[PDB]
Amino acid sequence: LDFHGQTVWVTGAGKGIGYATALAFVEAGANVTGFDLAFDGEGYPFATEMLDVADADQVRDVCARLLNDIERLDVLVNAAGILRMGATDQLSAEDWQQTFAVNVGGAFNLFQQTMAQFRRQRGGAIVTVASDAAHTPRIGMSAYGASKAALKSLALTVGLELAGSGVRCNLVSPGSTDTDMQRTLWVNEDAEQQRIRGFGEQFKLGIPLGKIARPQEIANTILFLASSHASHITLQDIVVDGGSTLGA
Template sequence: MTSWNFAGKRVLVTGAAGGIGRCVAERFRAEGARVVGLDLAAPNAGGNGNAEAELIALDITDPRQVDEVCGRILGESGSLDILVNAAGVLRLGAAEDLTLDDWQACFGVNVSGAFYLMRRCIPLFKRQRSGVIVNVASNAAHVPRVGMTAYCASKAAMVSLSHCVGLELAPFGVRCNVVSPGSTDTPMLRGMFKNPSDGQRLLAGLPEHFKLGIPLGKLASPEEIADVVLFLASDRSSHVTLQDVVVDGGATLGA
């Protein structure tokens, strides 16, 4: 396993209770970082007393909660090295079938939540004249999908938001990049499967949804996505910003 040397780095990760976010948080901790995870599903609000493995309950769609929790975290530490926005939700349905709750949930978590976190952390990054933001979007930001209107639109907005933030922060030496996973073996993806054959159909492609198959012939693992997140957060990518790295086994054929 690659060593990234994050010893002593202060890292904030959203969506840290499960899926890609949890894997990212665990990988940073394994590399010696001091990680605070944020997630609505955190089992122990306020953490468990271990600064190396703190998980705080937070609804990132509520800007007041974000301001309060971030104020407490950043006030205690006085610094932040890395922010990873990995929280995400998926609501399926054609445009005319989506409820307002579906639409607002996708944009609330996938875009607004990331914005609230970045807005709160940016002044600190600017004062430090250092820091890294990695936002987790989706390859769905690059290609349309039948039945994924809200999700695709929200992830495309996340990419554009990230690029704008990255441009604003570049003069301060702060980098902002995006990782766009394809189909990844997480509980969210498994929740979409209605029968055992759905996984193989996903690998082969879903023509009725205008979705290509995966040339590498397998789902991504959360660890494979985390590898790219850690690379973009590390000094090994010190001249990389405003980029969107698609990690989907070739499913978008380079789009």
């Protein structure tokens, strides 16, 4: 895929899926800016902007500054997110609020600050990273899954709001991935994954393909949806999970 000459923004670009996605865009020729709360890695091969996406005023100031100096924003990737686990009646007030502020509010702020640019330029692509938890109820993750379902709903209506401007808006819903989330077990056994096997007593299916996701496999799906090869695709959500939701 040739993204040479295209301007690409990626949130959550400090690590994990967002970093792998920004890197893939760089490797495909794009002019990339990454946004995150922290950039703790040693090297980032793209422009970095420190930003709390859950701070509406900070998002306004940063996006307005950057938008004043670009002719078009070809691709926006929303990939910020946090996980706070807990049974619904055990979850703290702070974990509930921060889950929604980051996981939905973040994209909301980005949309509020970029939709006018998309309408003015008339075209471009948005890809939003949701979660398989937006597709199925998950013991221990009720708030997380609910925040991701809200994000998916918001992104789809934004897609409808921008479709008349020729803008395409899609999502990717990763399953278990080698990075972030619950990547490490509570014992010294990771190895042959428990995640691949499933956990039937909590109505959690295993993974039919027999492996968890690599970040590159999420990134490459994002790049496809961001590309002219997806030029008739909008309002779709590609689950990238080895079949674990069985297509849900």
